[PDB]
């Protein structure tokens, strides 16, 4: 129950439960498959 | 992009990668397997330690120099002291095993040299004395050290003459046994998978060795100018599908 | 649902003869050996549930800090300018004997902290102090002065309440394993001299207290009492109750030349 | 003895046999690990569990 | 770092040995990285020993 | 949901050899290089959410 | 014609027969079982030597005399040196096991005496010094010898006072732990099956013992007239469902 | 009504109403019937 009118006044947000490290761990242009050779 | 050339073998808790392989040999085209009931005789249930014995043990390294004649290890002897493989070995009456052997030797594109890596089932050695002199136990159970074919004749030991395979046959014909070459220009490792080969379903691991692994320089090592004149050779071996049976008190063996 | 009606018996089936050597306690009832009448239980055994047994607040710790001029104090910790406590449930014995009736125990904790002030020497008044209790998990910087950067507590839970009031919050089961070990017959490693019995398996964090107020002209003693209530209790493997007195947090050791714990009869074995 | 780009480099010697290249314990919150991003984040938490990936790139 | 809770050691040795080509010399180096597997769990947040201060900063 | 069961390997497919020069961190797991058994995560990563990290 | 009285336990390559048993206790009514995946944490495949470790080891015998106070063994310590069980123990990082304990003591229908045989999960001992003196490692790792409660206090050792269970609780209440009596007039053996009890799924076998087995004379031994005044007590124990994990180099432990 | 998000913050648990002393009072391997002889 929100007792207040504005959105800033609500409690903390709830877990992204998004999670996708590939923008950080695999930003390569041509896709690399694990097990296939790195450099062909 | 798979090449015959790069390989990974993972066995137990240990992994080997080679980026310069030349395929791998599987003796007699058979892969190690456990002992089937139809072939069984001893009524005892066997023990299969699995991953604690079926991992890769790297023996101490050898040094190939221009004067090297070749080295010889016996199995299961070479592993008589490796981790739990060895304990099991001394503690059961009977045991059985296959192996993956990986011999390693890297150099550069200026070196030349070529080793023969061969597995000989039942390699009965000859006494250098001739006649019917026997080869004492200790001499055929060198352990991880193996036998150094360029060491001197000793008394009660085997002959160490390379053109004769330590038994009255010519080096040239060893190629009838499962084998692979390490030619610095091609190759940097050799891998052979050994299935269990015997005339009985299971045997004693201490009174009888069932294969000798032999690494022999054939085209002499030739290093580039002002290079150090030697390369180390390393042997890593992994028991596979090992089974032990008839547990008890723990064998005591000569020396 | 307590006793059924049962009458005379003349059988070949004797429920009262057993062999205790077996380790069992055979479930014998009044009606196996006297003639009984029906009666009902009228009772459920509600208040003997382990959640109930371990579920009331017990005092687990009393400490004390003071508000005074820190000017020229070389060791705040030592002047009780602030104070820490590594959480335990085995320092005051009442709750300890209760928990050690079990080997492994798992529960959430609810802490209540009461703080009261004392002014043992001449003051014009009673000041109103705010206490800060910081939860300091192992690896966090520990306070060195009563007003260190540590007290910023940007990542470490801390509660601010007033002396005279009470603070209350609840911490989930923070054990590293599946349960807390009430006992541990081990070492932290195979060392020849490492400590025996005391283990991290029991570790529940640690807490640092201080007054936020600067000093007034008089000095004020604030004494902190931490109460702990187990909620969501789970207990495994009952053990024999503690008979001798306790000597140390975390060891089973009892004092030497202790006194006989079994009351001697005033009379014979035959005495009533 | 002072932070340098060189403490990122593990040296290798030609022609040594059998010998040891480096050693470290695995207290990820201390010692070599401590300034790494992993080490640096682990330090915001009290407990860790899981597998680590250690890789070596040859130059 | 805690004993009971300790994780092991990591070591590295020559398996055969480094060999340099002609006309080449000296030491070669390995770079080493660390990251966590997807396996990893971290819990119970707290304050880092990696940063502290003695007076508030100003502009 | 942490590790699957995996046994001996003798392949031409080596997931542990990579080229870090590329800038990627290849997602290698225990089961690519030792023999593993199944285990579950039992965990969600709740307390490492940025809302939680900056939210006290 | 089955009696509670006669029994046979065959485990591995070893069998025990008792013709005068008093049922058998299974701690907490649970039988030893392997570690399920849902409960697993370490990702390593475990090793299950089976019949080579799950057999019966008979520890050296004790002598009950009229002055005996009682003996105490810790598990897995007591077995730290038995055959391949012990090797596995020193060689893996973690291991887990349940046991069958069989305590034996026979006499005649003229003797009297009664022993309590009890298993205590997590038996943390007390220092006889009091205060917060610790009990050094060696003292809580007596090996097959176990601890002799009628031996003298030693320094760094535990207290050996029987009315207090070596921990501040009364002998009389040990009956809350799985236990069985050996009453010469009834019984001649005691058998207890111990499931693995811990707060973690698998643990170290050397830094932590998870049960102490305790044999305590309670009704003093009384031999017939002009009989020798003593009886031997023998303890035989068999690991069951053992699993080892995290193999490596081989632990080195104090003393 | 829980006012709080985390489970630790809820009140005491509610009675097991489990109750089974046999793991403690009768951990024998072969079942003993009351009335039948203890040792056969």
UniProtKB/Swiss-Prot annotation, chains B, G:
Leader peptide range in chain numbering: none
Superkingdom: Viruses
Subunit structure: Interacts with capsid protein VP1 and capsid protein VP3 in the mature capsid.
Listed name of the protein: Capsid protein VP2
Subcellular location: Virion; Host cytoplasm
Function according to Swiss-Prot or TrEMBL: Forms an icosahedral capsid of pseudo T=3 symmetry with capsid proteins VP2 and VP3. The capsid is 300 Angstroms in diameter, composed of 60 copies of each capsid protein and enclosing the viral positive strand RNA genome.
Swiss-Prot record, chain E:
Function summary: Forms an icosahedral capsid of pseudo T=3 symmetry with capsid proteins VP2 and VP3. The capsid is 300 Angstroms in diameter, composed of 60 copies of each capsid protein and enclosing the viral positive strand RNA genome.
Native species: Human rhinovirus 14
Cell compartment(s), UniProt: Virion; Host cytoplasm
Subunit-level organization: Interacts with capsid protein VP0 and capsid protein VP1 to form heterotrimeric protomers. Five protomers subsequently associate to form pentamers which serve as building blocks for the capsid. Interacts with capsid protein VP4 in the mature capsid. Interacts with protein 2C; this interaction may be important for virion morphogenesis.
Protein name, as recorded: Capsid protein VP3
Top-rank lineage group of the source organism: Viruses
